[PDB]
Amino acid sequence: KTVVVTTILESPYVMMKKNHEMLEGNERYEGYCVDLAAEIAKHCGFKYKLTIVGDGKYGARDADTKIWNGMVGELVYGKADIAIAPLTITYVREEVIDFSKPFMSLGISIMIKKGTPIESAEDLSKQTEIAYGTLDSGSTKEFFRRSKIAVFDKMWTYMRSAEPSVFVRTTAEGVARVRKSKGKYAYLLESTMNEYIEQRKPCDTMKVGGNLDSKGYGIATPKGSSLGNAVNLAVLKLSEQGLLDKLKNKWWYDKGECGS
Amino acid sequence: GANKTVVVTTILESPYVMMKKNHEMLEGNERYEGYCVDLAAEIAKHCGFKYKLTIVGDGKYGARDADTKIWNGMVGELVYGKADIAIAPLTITYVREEVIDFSKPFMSLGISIMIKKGTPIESAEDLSKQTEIAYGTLDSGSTKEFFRRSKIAVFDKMWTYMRSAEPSVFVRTTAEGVARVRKSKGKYAYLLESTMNEYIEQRKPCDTMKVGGNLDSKGYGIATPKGSSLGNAVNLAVLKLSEQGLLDKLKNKWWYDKGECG
Numbered sequence A: 001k002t003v004v005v006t007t008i009l010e011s012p013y014v015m016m017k018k019n020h021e022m023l024e025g026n027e028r029y030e031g032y033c034v035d036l037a038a039e040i041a042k043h044c045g046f047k048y049k050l051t052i053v054g055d056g057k058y059g060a061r062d063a064d065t066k067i068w069n070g071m072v073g074e075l076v077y078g079k080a081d082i083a084i085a086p087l088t089i090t091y092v093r094e095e096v097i098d099f100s101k102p103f104m105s106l107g108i109s110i111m112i113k114k115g116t117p118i119e120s121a122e123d124l125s126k127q128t129e130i131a132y133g134t135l136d137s138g139s140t141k142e143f144f145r146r147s148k149i150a151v152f153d154k155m156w157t158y159m160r161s162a163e164p165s166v167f168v169r170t171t172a173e174g175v176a177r178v179r180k181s182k183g184k185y186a187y188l189l190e191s192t193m194n195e196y197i198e199q200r201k202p203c204d205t206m207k208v209g210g211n212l213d214s215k216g217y218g219i220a221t222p223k224g225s226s227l228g229n230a231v232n233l234a235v236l237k238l239s240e241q242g243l244l245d246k247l248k249n250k251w252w253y254d255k256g257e258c259g260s
Numbered sequence B: 001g002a003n004k005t006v007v008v009t010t011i012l013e014s015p016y017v018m019m020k021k022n023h024e025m026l027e028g029n030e031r032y033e034g035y036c037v038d039l040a041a042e043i044a045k046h047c048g049f050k051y052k053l054t055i056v057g058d059g060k061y062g063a064r065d066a067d068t069k070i071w072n073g074m075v076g077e078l079v080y081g082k083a084d085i086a087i088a089p090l091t092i093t094y095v096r097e098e099v100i101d102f103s104k105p106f107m108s109l110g111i112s113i114m115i116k117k118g119t120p121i122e123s124a125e126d127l128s129k130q131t132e133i134a135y136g137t138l139d140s141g142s143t144k145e146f147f148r149r150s151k152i153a154v155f156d157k158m159w160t161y162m163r164s165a166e167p168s169v170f171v172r173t174t175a176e177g178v179a180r181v182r183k184s185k186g187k188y189a190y191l192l193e194s195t196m197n198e199y200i201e202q203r204k205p206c207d208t209m210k211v212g213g214n215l216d217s218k219g220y221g222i223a224t225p226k227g228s229s230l231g232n233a234v235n236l237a238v239l240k241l242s243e244q245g246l247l248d249k250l251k252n253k254w255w256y257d258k259g260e261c262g
């Protein structure tokens, strides 16, 4: 009767606690999605086990093999019962798994090292001194691959062939590359993650320009799962009680690392 | 059996659905224009159905009578089988999700405050702590329900005031709330969704303003009767339109490209 929850190590959604090496089970983890999982499970009346996605990916389909990886794959192949993570609701994913109504909003955004002479996606597209890229196997990369918008398509044509690769395996790696590249790398990532990082030491990154799109994260289940309806009602209840706002404010709490 | 014209319930709410110039000699869907008229056409094209737009009889979004338990508005038209789909600025809410289905959201919004320019109010907390400036909400919608149900002290305080205020602070249509702000010399502020607030802020005579942050975060969805076979296709259409940038293009068309305040 224990529900297997797939999730991903992505700050501040799920993180290893201090001294996690002597902790066990769900108690190893903390973050927005850890708290959200506990609330959803309490409303729906299930016990659950948090498991970190084996390949560390969000989820994409191989164009050749047509196999899904990441958390999406874990749902598709029956390795998990639900995904509670910053997993973007997208058309291609909705074809193969189910999603609750969104629990958090986001859009694609630009992270620069402070002082970089870039204010917009158009700015990035019109120059070549500053490299830029995205996370592999997620919705941001797919956004650029599929876009017919001139600026974004121009960006895709550059990124897909850039050498060395501009794509990164994890968000943390993209952020580190921004920080270490003396302004010669900018990173395309979701506004949620960008805003979290902007408020943390060493306070050397910034979000610039407006978001490139508008969407949300949802709780995902395998297609047709019996859990979907109750999970969706739980998201709506927690939204209306103000609990999703409370969790956002807790995990994006500003302690004054950067200025004050 | 054979394909049948889909009955779309919607609501006369600018800029979502508006009477076209020359509507008096036009018929059918041609009578109307706006964001939801354009959206209905896109959804119908993707889903492969023909449709008839029909303005909700009672002019309401939809609420359940606590005594009779009967649903009114667009929600009621779906619940009682009078319409096949609602394409409107209909907020996705818990109590509605219990009785009808919703697509993923096609537009985001939150509850917000509209003031007459110069009114000395910056926030809901400001409103809650004074009595000179009256304030209220639309009837039979999700904003009123938000206040009625809130356990948050500031919003509970606001509800306690609004529910007993005399004369009534509630309005039957958004237009009536706008008029009350505009005519009340700063002595009425209106609680309404950020989408509608931002639209009115760009309409003549450019005398209103949104103040403060939004009080919540939610969205509008396309609604169908519970279990309707149309829901899956409509949902995928919303996602496709979102990802193609078409929803953003439509919002800019109806809010900003046509703005009258500069």
Ligand SMILES: NS(=O)(=O)c1cc2c(cc1Cl)N[C@H]([C@H]1C[C@H]3C=C[C@@H]1C3)NS2(=O)=O
Pocket (backbone or CB within 6 Å): A101, A102, A103, A104, A105, A106, A216, A217, A236, A239, A240, A244, A245, A246, A248, B091, B092, B093, B105, B108, B217, B218, B219, B220
């Ligand atoms: N401010 S936020 O992104 O934490 C945030 C974002 C969102 C919230 C709640 C919060 Cl707190 N709830 C809404 C939900 C309420 C109902 C209407 C839309 C979904 C279903 N989703 S959202 O609009 O994606």
Ligand SMILES: NS(=O)(=O)c1cc2c(cc1Cl)N[C@H]([C@H]1C[C@H]3C=C[C@@H]1C3)NS2(=O)=O
Pocket (backbone or CB within 6 Å): A088, A089, A090, A102, A105, A214, A215, A216, A217, B104, B105, B106, B107, B108, B109, B219, B220, B238, B239, B242, B243, B246, B247, B248, B249, B251
């Ligand atoms: N900027 S906006 O409100 O017009 C707006 C708002 C939204 C859009 C698209 C636009 Cl253009 N799409 C998203 C949709 C994309 C997928 C993720 C959440 C739903 C399904 N809904 S939203 O986040 O409510």
Ligand SMILES: N[C@@H](CCC(=O)O)C(=O)O
Pocket (backbone or CB within 6 Å): A058, A059, A086, A087, A088, A089, A135, A137, A138, A139, A140, A141, A188, A189, A190
């Ligand atoms: N939230 C994204 C991952 C991050 C990104 O692609 O920027 C997804 O669900 O794929």
Ligand SMILES: N[C@@H](CCC(=O)O)C(=O)O
Pocket (backbone or CB within 6 Å): B061, B062, B089, B090, B091, B092, B138, B140, B141, B142, B143, B144, B191, B192, B193
């Ligand atoms: N969108 C709201 C109506 C507007 C409001 O309540 O402010 C609803 O679906 O009830």
